[PDB]
Amino acid sequence: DAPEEEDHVLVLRKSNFAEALAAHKYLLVEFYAPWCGHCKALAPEYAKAAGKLKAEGSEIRLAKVDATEESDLAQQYGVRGYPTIKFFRNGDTASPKEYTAGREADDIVNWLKKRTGPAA
């Protein structure tokens, strides 16, 4: 039907993954579960980094997945427990990068700025 979203970020699945990756160059995605406890410490922080672009118009977007709902892309990648964040660049499917942060929206834009930045 249509790609649903959450607050300011989107969600991924067994059908949106292969698409969102090869559809948007900058696309963030994290694997977590409804029972996880450290997967919500930045729920409003991981969504604020996606609104910082709404005022500009960049093409960077973040996403999240329910390892308990899909569990089809997490078992294939061999995740190592939640929360598990991952960054895809225009569909990589080979050697994606990993987020070394996890504290607030700033940590999300800080890693995203390394690829965009102002450079005015």
From Swiss-Prot:
Its main location: endoplasmic reticulum. It is linked to Cole-Carpenter syndrome 1: A form of Cole-Carpenter syndrome, a disorder characterized by features of osteogenesis imperfecta such as bone deformities and severe bone fragility with frequent fractures, in association with craniosynostosis, ocular proptosis, hydrocephalus, growth failure and distinctive facial features. Craniofacial findings include marked frontal bossing, midface hypoplasia, and micrognathia. Despite the craniosynostosis and hydrocephalus, intellectual development is normal. CLCRP1 inheritance is autosomal dominant. The chain holds residues 18 to 137 of 508 of the full protein. This is Protein disulfide-isomerase. One of its GO terms (molecular function) is integrin binding. Reduces and may activate fusogenic properties of HIV-1 gp120 surface protein, thereby enabling HIV-1 entry into the cell. Heterodimer; heterodimerizes with the protein microsomal triglyceride transfer MTTP. Homodimer. Monomers and homotetramers may also occur. Interacts with P4HA2, forming a heterotetramer consisting of 2 alpha subunits (P4HA2) and 2 beta (P4HB), where P4HB plays the role of a structural subunit; this tetramer catalyzes the formation of 4-hydroxyproline in collagen. Also constitutes the structural subunit of the microsomal triacylglycerol transfer protein MTTP in mammalian cells. Stabilizes both enzymes and retain them in the ER without contributing to the catalytic activity. Binds UBQLN1. The keyword Cytoplasm does not apply. Belongs to the protein disulfide isomerase family. The record marks G37, H38 as: Contributes to redox potential value. The gene is P4HB.
